[PDB]
Amino acid sequence: KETKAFNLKTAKGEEKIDIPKDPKRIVVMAPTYAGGLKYLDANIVGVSDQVDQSPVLAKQFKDVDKVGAEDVEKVASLKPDLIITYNTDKNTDKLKKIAPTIAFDYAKYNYLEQQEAMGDIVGKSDEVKKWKADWEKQTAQDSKDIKAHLGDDTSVTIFEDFDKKIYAYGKNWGRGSEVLYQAFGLQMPKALDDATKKEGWTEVPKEEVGKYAGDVIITAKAKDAAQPEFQKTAMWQNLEAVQNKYAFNVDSSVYWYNDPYTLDVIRKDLKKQLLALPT
Ligand SMILES: [Cl-]
Ligand SMILES: [Cl-]
Ligand SMILES: [Cl-]
Ligand SMILES: [Cl-]
Ligand SMILES: [Cl-]
Ligand SMILES: [Cl-]
Ligand SMILES: [Cl-]
Ligand SMILES: [Cl-]
Missing domain, CATH: 3.40.50.1980 (Nitrogenase molybdenum iron protein domain)
Incomplete structure (x- = not known):
């Protein structure tokens, strides 16, 4: 499928990450980014189970599969074409084997950015x-x-x-x-x-x-x-x-x-x- 470069802000500057032009199966492991992608009607097929602890986000993700923070095999079973997580994620190297993975350095973006x-x-x-x-x-x-x-x-x-x-x-x-x-x-x-x-x-x-x-x-x-x-x-x-x-x-x-x-x-x-x- 068609790809595009997502320009991730990192400690090293900008890291170009090739992702789908139109992501069809996103797994969002970092709950910080879940609400924003949902608000944009993104094609989300898995989301961190942490969203259920927010009354706000829980009601938005009722029909989306929930994923445990370290459950890489769950992520794989969802056949993602894009994975979103934090750079703190111990499993980033494993996730990259499953699909294009953006591991955000959270602090590099203010909330509007x-x-x-x-x-x-x-x-x-x-x-x-x-x-x-x-x-x-x-x-x-x-x-x-x-x-x-x-x-x-x-x-x-x-x-x-x-x-x-x-x-x-x-x-x-x-x-x-x-x-x-x-x-x-x-x-x-x-x-x-x-x-x-x-x-x-x-x-x-x-x-x-x-x-x-x-x-x-x-x-x-x-x-x-x-x-x-x-x-x-x-x-x-x-x-x-x-x-x-x-x-x-x-x-x-x-x-x-x-x-x-x-x-x-x-x-x-x-x-x-x-x-x-x-x-
Ligand atoms: Cl395509
Ligand atoms: Cl590139
Ligand atoms: Cl490429
Ligand atoms: Cl496309
Ligand atoms: Cl004390
Ligand atoms: Cl204290
Ligand atoms: Cl202090
Ligand atoms: Cl002090």
């Missing part, structure tokens, strides 16, 4: 252009509405409570970061910027939560989890955001991703909760 790459893969760059323009126009208005309510210089911090540890995020690591820092243009506290610049995110020792706190503090957590321990302390209660009642929780399983489906949901939810402040 990422969806543009999905458009390039499936030959729907026009659709992405329209989606992008609509997204920028909507979130530009959202930004004005939110900054008018809270203040133009409003900063925000995203914590995630996960497996009894605390994480904080840079501007493009999901958990609402793309919407908050890029689309809405809210500020990131300097200390948090510095702590997340190199890797895009960081674990936060529990004693250091206050060092990274901004005007607004958003905690991503599981709906079925009890209150995080770090929200109980005197340190927490004395944060200006917490005193101003500018602190709220969001559903981490909804907020993990940065695909167009997740983006629509989190844009709406974040705008609602920000405009409802103070709590």
Whole structure:
């Protein structure tokens, strides 16, 4: 079948990967890219079973075969003509034997560039252009509405409570970061910027939560989890955001991703909760 070169951004620059001109049987092992390809009605025949842990993505993949993270034999059984994964995938060499494989270095694409790459893969760059323009126009208005309510210089911090540890995020690591820092243009506290610049995110020792706190503090957590321990302390209660009642929780399983489906949901939810402040 006809091929085309997909130009993958990597540490080494650009890596040309020959893929089908029109991919007919895509297996998406990296859930980051699943929503975006689905949004573009890509020919997906297998998807990481991780999508089922997001309420947003689960409803979009009900009739697609689910694949275990290391189940190479499942991937092979689906007879893919294209495989999408992360460069962290231990099995990349095995996957390349099955089909053309794009193992994304996630951090090389911001969330809009990422969806543009999905458009390039499936030959729907026009659709992405329209989606992008609509997204920028909507979130530009959202930004004005939110900054008018809270203040133009409003900063925000995203914590995630996960497996009894605390994480904080840079501007493009999901958990609402793309919407908050890029689309809405809210500020990131300097200390948090510095702590997340190199890797895009960081674990936060529990004693250091206050060092990274901004005007607004958003905690991503599981709906079925009890209150995080770090929200109980005197340190927490004395944060200006917490005193101003500018602190709220969001559903981490909804907020993990940065695909167009997740983006629509989190844009709406974040705008609602920000405009409802103070709590
Ligand atoms: Cl062909
Ligand atoms: Cl090439
Ligand atoms: Cl070739
Ligand atoms: Cl073709
Ligand atoms: Cl730290
Ligand atoms: Cl700790
Ligand atoms: Cl400790
Ligand atoms: Cl320290």
